[PDB]
């Protein structure tokens, strides 16, 4: 996250931290995710497509720090890694960028809700916030272009939803952004998601219910003028989510 604020998991308790174990036993951070039911985390297919082996991945809930333990945190393996069959990637744009991870503790159990672990509501069909709405994003991604390490503390920020009309302007993304995607950015281009934030939540207050409106997917650079963050429009994928869970 470029700019924004350091946060703690109690403020973002659906946030899932996804890592990958390597041969030799080193662990690296991959992407964020969102807990939508006790057994299911939702994320982005692009985070896993090149290494689609569920055994490689570790999922944490209730975790505020990248390489230290948080009290109340819970560690999971991936029982099922479901990638979207029509995923593809162009030069910038990623398509059907959505994935589901069925999680399981070593004891065979799903998540147990607590002060630091909670599910986030899915949106209803065809119902997204009006453009101009302020929404939040969360992740362990880069804070600046020059970072070669991710921040040790979880971050969040607030961005505004941008209309498809505006995001499809020539100096924005043109026809590369589709109606299955949502753009969001800072009007001053000072805060944004960045590499490492992918798969994380874009959450909007929708009829007073916090709702998983988007999933961090793509964008040209980070906090670049006229280059919004682009997000998987969760509301378009409800049949797919329903069928695969």
């Amino acid at each position: 996250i470029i700019g924004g604020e350091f946060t703690t998991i109690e403020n973002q308790p659906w946030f899932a931290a996804i890592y990958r174990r390597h041969r030799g036993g080193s662990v690296t951070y991959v992407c964020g995710g969102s807990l939508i039911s006790p057994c299911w985390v939702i994320s982005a297919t692009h985070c896993f497509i090149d290494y689609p082996k569920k055994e490689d991945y570790i999922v944490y809930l209730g975790r505020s720090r990248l390489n230290s333990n948080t009290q109340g945190e819970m560690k999971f393996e991936v029982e099922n890694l479901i990638l979207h069959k029509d995923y593809s990637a162009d030069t910038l744009a990623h398509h059907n960028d959505i994935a589901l991870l069925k999680i399981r503790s070593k004891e065979g159990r799903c998540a147990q809700p607590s002060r630091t672990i909670q599910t986030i509501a899915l949106p209803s069909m065809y119902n997204d916030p009006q453009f101009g709405t302020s929404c939040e994003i969360t992740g362990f991604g880069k804070e600046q272009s020059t970072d070669y390490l991710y921040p040790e503390q979880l971050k969040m920020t607030v961005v505004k939803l941008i209309s498809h009309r505006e995001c499809q302007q020539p100096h924005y993304y043109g026809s590369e952004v589709t109606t299955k995607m949502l753009c969001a950015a800072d009007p001053q281009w000072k805060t944004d998601s960045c590499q490492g934030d992918s798969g994380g939540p874009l959450v909007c207050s929708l009829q007073g219910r916090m709702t998983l409106t988007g999933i961090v997917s793509w964008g040209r650079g980070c906090a670049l003028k006229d280059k919004p963050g682009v997000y998987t429009r969760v509301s378009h994928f409800l049949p797919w989510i329903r069928s695969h869970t």
């Binding site: 990958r20 690296t28 991959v30 992407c31 692009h46 985070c47 896993f48 497509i49 090149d50 290494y51 990637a89 910038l92 990623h94 960028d97 991604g141 998601s193 960045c194 590499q195 490492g196 934030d197 992918s198 798969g199 961090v216 997917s217 793509w218 964008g219 040209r220 650079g221 980070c222 963050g229 682009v230």
Partner: peptide, 14 residues
């Protein structure tokens, strides 16, 4: 890997 932005996490680029 690729360090080119959102979309490139955990990729193989030899």
């Amino acid at each position: 890997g690729x360090a080119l932005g959102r979309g490139c996490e955990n990729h193989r680029c030899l």
